[PDB]
Design a protein around this ligand. Sequence first.
Ligand SMILES: NC(=O)c1ccc[n+]([C@@H]2O[C@H](COP(=O)([O-])OP(=O)(O)OC[C@H]3O[C@@H](n4cnc5c(N)ncnc54)[C@H](O)[C@@H]3O)[C@@H](O)[C@H]2O)c1
Ligand SMILES: NC(=O)c1ccc[n+]([C@@H]2O[C@H](COP(=O)([O-])OP(=O)(O)OC[C@H]3O[C@@H](n4cnc5c(N)ncnc54)[C@H](O)[C@@H]3O)[C@@H](O)[C@H]2O)c1
Ligand SMILES: O=c1ccn([C@@H]2O[C@H](COP(=O)(O)OP(=O)(O)O[C@H]3O[C@H](CO)[C@@H](O)[C@H](O)[C@H]3O)[C@@H](O)[C@H]2O)c(=O)[nH]1
Ligand SMILES: O=c1ccn([C@@H]2O[C@H](COP(=O)(O)OP(=O)(O)O[C@H]3O[C@H](CO)[C@@H](O)[C@H](O)[C@H]3O)[C@@H](O)[C@H]2O)c(=O)[nH]1
Lengths: 309, 308
Amino acid sequence: MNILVTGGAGFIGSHVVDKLIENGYGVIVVDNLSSGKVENLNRNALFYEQSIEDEEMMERIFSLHRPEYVFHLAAQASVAISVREPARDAKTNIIGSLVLLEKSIKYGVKKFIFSSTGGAIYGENVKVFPTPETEIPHPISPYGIAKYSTEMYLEFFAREYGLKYTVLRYANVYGPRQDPYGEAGVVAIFTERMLRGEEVHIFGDGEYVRDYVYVDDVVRANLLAMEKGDNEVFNIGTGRGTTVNQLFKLLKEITGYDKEPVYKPPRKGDVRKSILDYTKAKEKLGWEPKVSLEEGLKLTVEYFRKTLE
Amino acid sequence: MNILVTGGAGFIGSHVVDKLIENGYGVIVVDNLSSGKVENLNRNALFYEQSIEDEEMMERIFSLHRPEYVFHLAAQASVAISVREPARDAKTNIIGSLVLLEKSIKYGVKKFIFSSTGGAIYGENVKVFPTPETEIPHPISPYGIAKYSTEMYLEFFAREYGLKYTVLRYANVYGPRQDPYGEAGVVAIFTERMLRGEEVHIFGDGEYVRDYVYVDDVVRANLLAMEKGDNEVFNIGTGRGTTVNQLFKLLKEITGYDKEPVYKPPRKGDVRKSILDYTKAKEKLGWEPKVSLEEGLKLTVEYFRKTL
Ligand SMILES: NC(=O)c1ccc[n+]([C@@H]2O[C@H](COP(=O)([O-])OP(=O)(O)OC[C@H]3O[C@@H](n4cnc5c(N)ncnc54)[C@H](O)[C@@H]3O)[C@@H](O)[C@H]2O)c1
Ligand SMILES: NC(=O)c1ccc[n+]([C@@H]2O[C@H](COP(=O)([O-])OP(=O)(O)OC[C@H]3O[C@@H](n4cnc5c(N)ncnc54)[C@H](O)[C@@H]3O)[C@@H](O)[C@H]2O)c1
Ligand SMILES: O=c1ccn([C@@H]2O[C@H](COP(=O)(O)OP(=O)(O)O[C@H]3O[C@H](CO)[C@@H](O)[C@H](O)[C@H]3O)[C@@H](O)[C@H]2O)c(=O)[nH]1
Ligand SMILES: O=c1ccn([C@@H]2O[C@H](COP(=O)(O)OP(=O)(O)O[C@H]3O[C@H](CO)[C@@H](O)[C@H](O)[C@H]3O)[C@@H](O)[C@H]2O)c(=O)[nH]1
């Protein structure tokens, strides 16, 4: 069976590729290496260094390999970049998705499994925590609007053509291969700076709450979505909130870092609190996180240590 | 004062241009003539035959003319077509809007007035009519999804840069210069068929209810949104529902058409009923329709007779 993984050279996508390869699937990867890395690629997967919004190239790849599933992880994944360049962001995030969906219909894809976002979708005025999928989306960033627009297009493709899909709205994903450089998640930034004994910055008062979910658990969610959760949207998170202050403390203890954090002005656009309810994923996908935050942070620090040897 | 009107060679946009010119504004028009027509263009406007999604070209236009207001009417504005090539549709409908908004932010535009849609945004299970802006959006067509995505981006630009905007969600717009040969626009199709004595087709049972709003009234709402209704979404419609069968009868009486309609199979995706509550526009824009349907249909027939 052939499987297409877009964004397979990236943080989450490369782990998805590895797992599919391990389970015996034929895997085809599309990635333009805008943020992904050649080192992340699996030598057993077929690789196309190409862009998802390239209609002729996507036409060619789908016609050759007729993937039965598409795992769509390719995205402009930085919120800050989406703010600075919203048209370019939407070209990858919306138009890119629509090209893949057009080819998926044309070439008989059975199911499209889309990586979406929990944090950038529910908006800034949520009152129910942990937050369920029944909360109406109010995205405020271009990234969140693009992800939400694409989820709506998925429902269109299901209604019009009978394409099955699953949307996975991730919380804050962290772990090995997350890039600590550029537009990085705080786990990777903190871990790398602490190991190097560099200064660590906390924005605003550090009381921002997030739901940190380990990359291996997110990969398992993707695989469970192959045969379950048809035409459903799921939060993929832990339902546990952690402030940036608490996170710094955990990582400081693990790394043996011995400096205080430097408090900096608050970051524009930061939602105050994000925690996801995963009851639905538990009931319909049989999904639950297996790696606690403390276990996950230790694994993460361990991977980064090896990079520094 | 300079004003940019995108889609200014189209049905609604050409009338907006006319009204601005009449009121003494300098008007720049951007239209790629994908569905618009040179014959619609006001010769007093400065015309760029260019595409809104062209960043380099929009850079030049905004940099040169520094428009104070943008009336954004350019769209792949037809619901069929959006279904078969949604990526191409979203390139005009979403990416195009985003390019205009980036340039708007960069070159100090004061207000952006966006043409959106009522019907295709509220979706197919509405229970309250006439329908207020508080009704939760559930667009299921690529056209409605794209329009709604753009509305959401407009709020981002307002929050991030202080750009002021107004969204006008039109009902079913009809009147002079609506193209009777395109995908849609039942009023223009019926009028052209009837005046030519050709067959007239009613899809399904003809009991589909729409809210027909005259183009000159839609133009007045655009102009009222220059100074009022900052950062608000408004339904622009009449609050009155008309079946296709009723529309047929009205236009048959006006044209003197002497045939019965030919019924065809129902058209896939047609919502059963769309009627918009315009109370919010009435209060905040001071807007109301000045042209009743009967009066507007007569003006439309009047115009079509002259034009073919
Ligand atoms: N905490 C998180 O990391 C998080 C949270 C919520 C959602 N997500 C989503 O999960 C997916 C993967 O995220 P990630 O953390 O691994 O980021 P990532 O940057 O590491 O992976 C994205 C990959 O997509 C590639 N890419 C970007 N544009 C492309 C294009 N036009 N054509 C082909 N490839 C392109 C990049 O090169 C990159 O390898 C994304 O959809 C992202 O939005 C991630
Ligand atoms: N007519 C209605 O009943 C109705 C109802 C709801 C919303 N609207 C909206 O009002 C606006 C105008 O509608 P209309 O009836 O006048 O349609 P229209 O097709 O006559 O006008 C659209 C104009 O935009 C131009 N255009 C399309 N793509 C372009 C691009 N990429 N770059 C530059 N120009 C481009 C077309 O050439 C055309 O002249 C649209 O946004 C439409 O979606 C119309
Ligand atoms: O050096 C740093 C970096 C981050 N933060 C704080 O850490 C928190 C989390 O930031 P970040 O790691 O950037 O996560 P989010 O901004 O929440 O982004 C998450 O949410 C995005 C939008 O939902 C996802 O989709 C992203 O991939 C995901 O990492 C925020 O409060 C930041 O203020 C710091 O204090 N110091
Ligand atoms: O020959 C025809 C043509 C249309 N209809 C019917 O007329 C009604 C109105 O159709 P149409 O004129 O195509 O408009 P709509 O489909 O309602 O709606 C669109 O009107 C504009 C396009 O014409 C869109 O952009 C607006 O968003 C949306 O209101 C529908 O019930 C059709 O079934 C007929 O019966 N016979």
